[PDB]
Amino acid sequence: AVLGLQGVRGGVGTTTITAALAWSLQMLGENVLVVDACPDNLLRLSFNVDFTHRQGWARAMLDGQDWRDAGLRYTSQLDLLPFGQLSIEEQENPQHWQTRLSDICSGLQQLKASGRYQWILIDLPRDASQITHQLLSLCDHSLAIVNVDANCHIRLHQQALPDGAHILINNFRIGSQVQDDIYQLWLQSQRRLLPMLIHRDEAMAECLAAKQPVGEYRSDALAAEEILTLANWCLLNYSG
Amino acid sequence: AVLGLQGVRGGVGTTTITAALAWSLQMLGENVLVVDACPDNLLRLSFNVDFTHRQGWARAMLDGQDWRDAGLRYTSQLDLLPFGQLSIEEQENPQHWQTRLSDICSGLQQLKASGRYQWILIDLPRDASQITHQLLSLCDHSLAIVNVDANCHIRLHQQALPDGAHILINNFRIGSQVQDDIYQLWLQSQRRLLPMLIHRDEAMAECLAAKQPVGEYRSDALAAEEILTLANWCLLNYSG
Amino acid sequence: DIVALKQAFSLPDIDYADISQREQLAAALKRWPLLAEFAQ
Amino acid sequence: PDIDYADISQREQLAAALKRWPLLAEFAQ
Amino acid sequence: VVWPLNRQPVPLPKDMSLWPSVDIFVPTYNEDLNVVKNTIYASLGIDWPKDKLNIWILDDGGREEFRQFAQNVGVKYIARTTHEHAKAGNINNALKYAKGEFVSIFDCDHVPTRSFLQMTMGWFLKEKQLAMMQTPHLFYGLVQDGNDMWDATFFCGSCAVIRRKPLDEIGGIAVETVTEDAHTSLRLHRRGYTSAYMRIPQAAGLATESLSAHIGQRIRWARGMVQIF
Amino acid sequence: NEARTAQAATVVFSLQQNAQIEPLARSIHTLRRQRGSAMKILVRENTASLRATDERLLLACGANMVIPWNAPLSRCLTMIESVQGQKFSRYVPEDITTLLSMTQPLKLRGFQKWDVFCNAVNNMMNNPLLPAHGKGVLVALRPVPGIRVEQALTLCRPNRTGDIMTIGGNRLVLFLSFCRINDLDTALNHIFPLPTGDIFSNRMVWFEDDQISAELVQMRLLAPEQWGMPLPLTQSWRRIPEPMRLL
Amino acid sequence: AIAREDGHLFSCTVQDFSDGGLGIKINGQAQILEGQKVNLLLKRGQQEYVFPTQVARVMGNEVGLKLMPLTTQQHIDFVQCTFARAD
Ligand SMILES: Nc1nc2c(ncn2[C@@H]2O[C@@H]3COP(=O)(O)O[C@H]4[C@@H](O)[C@H](n5cnc6c(=O)[nH]c(N)nc65)O[C@@H]4COP(=O)(O)O[C@H]3[C@H]2O)c(=O)[nH]1
Ligand SMILES: Nc1nc2c(ncn2[C@@H]2O[C@@H]3COP(=O)(O)O[C@H]4[C@@H](O)[C@H](n5cnc6c(=O)[nH]c(N)nc65)O[C@@H]4COP(=O)(O)O[C@H]3[C@H]2O)c(=O)[nH]1
Ligand SMILES: Nc1ncnc2c1ncn2[C@@H]1O[C@H](COP(=O)(O)OP(=O)(O)OP(=O)(O)O)[C@@H](O)[C@H]1O
Ligand SMILES: Nc1ncnc2c1ncn2[C@@H]1O[C@H](COP(=O)(O)OP(=O)(O)OP(=O)(O)O)[C@@H](O)[C@H]1O
Ligand SMILES: [Mg+2]
Ligand SMILES: [Mg+2]
């Protein structure tokens, strides 16, 4: 029901993958709600939301308003809840507001218990914040995003993933000896690595510039097919 | 002088760029001391530091030991100050220790007054922490590492760069249309962009596997030459 | 290239107006909505 | 994490991969 | 050459809508497609508004490969029915179909740099009476800079810009001498029009030329000067 | 050209590209229709140039024996001298058009309606000029309760024209033309994500003409209301988010 | 710059050029094999343009490359980066 996608490393493509996965789920007839937990709030821009749209659940909670009115509907089977723009002073001092977003966990629990949303994707950052840990606790399933390179290989042996987190590969190049070696090592060593990997496709680099998910921006791209396969796998496995 | 390298986004290539820059500066006859401040602590491995080597300034101060004892002699003109490994509980609870690492700042000022090292490179993370802000203030010059993609272009117009920081482009790919468009836009929308670019070289991907700087790994690669050009520009401009 | 030509002579006040660069930039802003939104 | 490094050196391609890159060999031990 | 003028380019107005229209002519008779392709590619790369620049290929051989290239890259292409008066007659015939305010002529071997019209057209927009501007294709370079002091810089047959209305008023390029360029410059000077010279390299393409070319030019020039006199 | 003058000389053909299948087949037909049965026509694959249906077409065209690329040169020559002393005793029709038509009798790719699917499969199975029990395989897949059947349909991306798919009765029905039972898993992996069996609970497979016909007859007795349509087509410019309250 | 399929990038200096291709001198040691499709990166002002080439002749450190069938815009970029220079 709850599928939280978190990046082992920054820049692996957590937000674009989350948008593509949400679009693929909504293309299969499932009700989808996307929640951007990233403080930078870059997920809204992938759904044709104006950059000046300051609304967001976190912004409403900090301002004392009701976050439920901050929801944005993309399509009948896809709803969006952007984080909300934060002022420079707030970004410089995250500790002054990190503990003020407690009620969002209760709201997400109520949304899950409602049944109107069959899938509630959460775009999580990597900052070890208390709200992030609470969201991980309320997440039924997790997907840790890694890339086939030395940095992610190093990370996978010292930092602890949340329990139950499958490993997903993104930005997989073609014709790199070190990358092939690391991929084979992960195939024969990493039990939680998913069977699906997403090759480097310029469609993923152009989806954010086009302010659309890669599924809607270009369905015929290889990235779209891989994301749809990942969505079907998630439906099969994470449903219960 | 004191130069601090920080990335506007995770995984842009800040650590590898810092290590290559330190090697390029030391191979030109300048004494360079490089300090690892990111909690991930991945700067050591580029200098043939064993993974089991848990000695680091952060851990040294957390155990009541002397942080100066955690230094390593790599070459006669490069010394390293490893951050040190953190336990899983420490990683998941940064607040319990992130305010106890301030002692390194005044010690770094003392080191700046020592004069032994002509360059003090710092691996500045982007955790928006008090220590990060203090170290950034202590840095005489700041270099912001960005990539030519949608995410970095979005971030540059909604996040604040360090005062006087200059922008360096890493992971400049080949045959990408959106990359060319964004670079042409930045050629006039930004005035802080350096005239040198770092390409997507396999040597930079393999350097971390070989536990060597890219120049030390292979000095004939174009990325190493670009790092050397960056070092020359820093010498000509960031001298004072 | 242009800088080299301007260094080989004085050419102090001839501001170069690259038609190709301006046209490519205009096409890029027309094609990518995010760039158009942020530029103006 | 779930790491099973046992019985890895039994493959020629994996052995070559570990030999070529010291980082992989250091981690796999 | 007592006092070389050392003329420098006048900046164009910052309003790109006030710039004039230029028609580039590349006349060829027997040159292979390999030579003319480079010149046409460079011409399309000239930094100038696209709606204010039209490129024309004038092939006297009626070669179909040139027509295919012109259709592919979009540049215009005109071949004459007859072949009288050689290059001068070819350009005169092509002038009946062009509609630009200025006519630029480039040889097949010459490669026009993208900063050609930007550095050239400023004087035409500034000084109204200026009807011709010449760019270098050493001794010749300084005789042409010294001549510009006295307004005696003459057309050298290539890499020049000519104002359209004065050119059509004098009856087009002269065809009575082997050196049509010098006679055209003389006719322009006779009616009170002025000529200029800018000593900024284009791309110079051909290297050395050897004495084989040196003698071609040396002779065709002496005969033309004698005929003009 | 030299073969049209020879009467019984062995003719060994080496094939390297798939485009040269039909003209070479035509030429083999010509040789079998001009030089009698005493001639020995052989086909030697080099890297990868033939399929089972194309191999059968070459055999029917007059080839004495096809040598696959897997066999090395020595075994190739061994078989070439093995065929010594034999005459072509099979019948080759005058018209090459029918033989070419047997190579592809469906010529329609993509999702099809249930009636259209049944009609096409039955028409292919009713063609006398096709091998018996080798025309293809019909497989019915039962989805895991995790997903519905339309999503399973959207999962598959078959690549050959002879593959047809449809949805009916909570089952995915697939007809693969000219596919053997042994290499069914290879076909499924080619037309699905690799972990088949993690995407369906169970399967039913038919590769015999009578079994396929009986399955078609059984399938024709189903309610039209359970027949599905592609999800992207039914579901399907910039979409502006409309603000609303989450309740 | 010359980019291999392996991702290795090598700085080079162009010796001679023509419509058939370019002959360059490669700094350092590089085991570039003939018949290998490589990418040539040329610098135009502050921009980089990538041209796909195939190596047709290697003479020690001197390497000759030939252009695959080019497009119109690629041709214009090539002529701007090769002939219409600041010389
Ligand atoms: N109907 C059907 N069957 C499929 C499909 N994919 C695989 N097969 C089956 O798999 C057998 C072995 O294919 P392979 O191992 O790739 O080895 C193949 C392959 O290397 C080559 N080949 C044949 N057709 C093609 C083609 O269209 N493209 C490519 N790239 N190779 C082909 O010929 C070999 C033998 O092919 P076959 O004798 O036909 O035998 C084929 C065929 O019966 C498919 O999409 N549809
Ligand atoms: N490895 C493998 N891949 C398979 C097999 N069957 C199909 N494919 C894949 O399916 C693609 C589409 O083939 P098609 O629709 O039959 O359309 C095919 C077919 O009409 C024709 N073709 C290619 N090889 C042969 C051949 O040996 N015999 C015949 N009769 N046609 C062929 O060329 C078209 C293009 O095929 P491709 O570009 O190669 O691309 C092929 C190939 O990637 C198979 O057995 N093995
Ligand atoms: N498979 C891919 N191929 C090409 N580009 C990709 C791919 N995946 C992601 N990208 C690009 O990488 C950049 C980073 O992706 P994304 O915007 O999701 O960042 P992120 O991982 O959420 O990072 P952060 O949390 O720091 O913002 C984007 O410009 C995106 O288009
Ligand atoms: N120019 C480059 N070309 C190719 N790969 C590069 C380049 N720069 C860095 N990399 C690779 O990118 C990966 C991440 O780079 P690096 O760790 O330096 O970035 P970072 O911003 O410090 O990331 P983080 O701190 O989030 O781990 C490494 O595997 C590194 O080798
Ligand atoms: Mg993100
Ligand atoms: Mg770092």
Residue numbers in the entry:
A (entry chain W), B (entry chain Q): 2 to 241
C (entry chain V): 21 to 60
D (entry chain R): 32 to 60
E (entry chain A): 254 to 390, 414 to 505
F (entry chain E): 256 to 491, 505 to 515
G (entry chain A): 708 to 794
Question: What does the literature reporting this entry say, word for word?
Answer:
Bacterial cellulosic polymers constitute a prevalent class of biofilm matrix exopolysaccharides that are synthesized by several types of bacterial cellulose secretion (Bcs) systems, which include conserved cyclic diguanylate (c-di-GMP)-dependent cellulose synthase modules together with diverse accessory subunits. In E. coli, the biogenesis of phosphoethanolamine (pEtN)-modified cellulose relies on the BcsRQABEFG macrocomplex, encompassing inner-membrane and cytosolic subunits, and an outer membrane porin, BcsC. Here we present cryo-EM structures of the E. coli Bcs macrocomplex positioning all seven BcsRQABEFG partners and multiple c-di-GMP-binding sites.
To gain mechanistic insights into the c-di-GMP-dependent regulation, we kept low micromolar concentrations of the dinucleotide (2–4 µM) throughout the purification procedure and prepared the cryogrids after a final fast concentration step to ∼2:1 c-di-GMP:Bcs macrocomplex ratio. Interestingly, the remaining particles showed a c-di-GMP-free BcsA synthase and a more extended vestibule conformation, where the central BcsEREC* domains engage in a different dimerization interface mediated by the pairs of β1–β2 connecting loops (melted α1 relative to canonical response regulators) and the C-proximal α-helices (canonical α5). Densities for the PilZ-proximal GGDEF* domain feature markedly lower-resolution, however, the conformation for both BcsEREC*-GGDEF* tandems is still consistent with the closed BcsE state and intercalated c-di-GMP complexation. The overall BcsE fold features a more extended conformation along the NTPase*-REC* domain linkers, neither BcsE protomer contacts the cytosolic synthase modules and the X-shaped BcsF dimer is found shifted near the fifth and fourth BcsB protomer as opposed to the c-di-GMP-saturated complex shown above. Nevertheless, the BcsRQ tandem is retained as an apical complex and the synthase-proximal BcsQ and BcsR protomers engage in similarly extensive contacts with the catalytic and PilZ modules. The latter is only partially rotated around the hinge helix relative to the c-di-GMP-bound state (12.8° rotation and 1.7 Å displacement) and the N-proximal PilZ domain linker is partially unstructured but remains far from gating loop-stabilizing interactions with the BcsAGT core. Although this vestibule is observed in two discreet c-di-GMP-bound conformations dependent on dinucleotide abundance and stabilizing BcsB-BcsF interactions, BcsA remains BcsRQ-bound and, as a result, presents a catalytically competent conformation even in the absence of direct dinucleotide complexation. We further demonstrate that BcsE, a secondary c-di-GMP sensor, can remain dinucleotide-bound and retain the essential-for-secretion BcsRQ partners onto the synthase even in the absence of direct c-di-GMP-synthase complexation, likely lowering the threshold for c-di-GMP-dependent synthase activation.
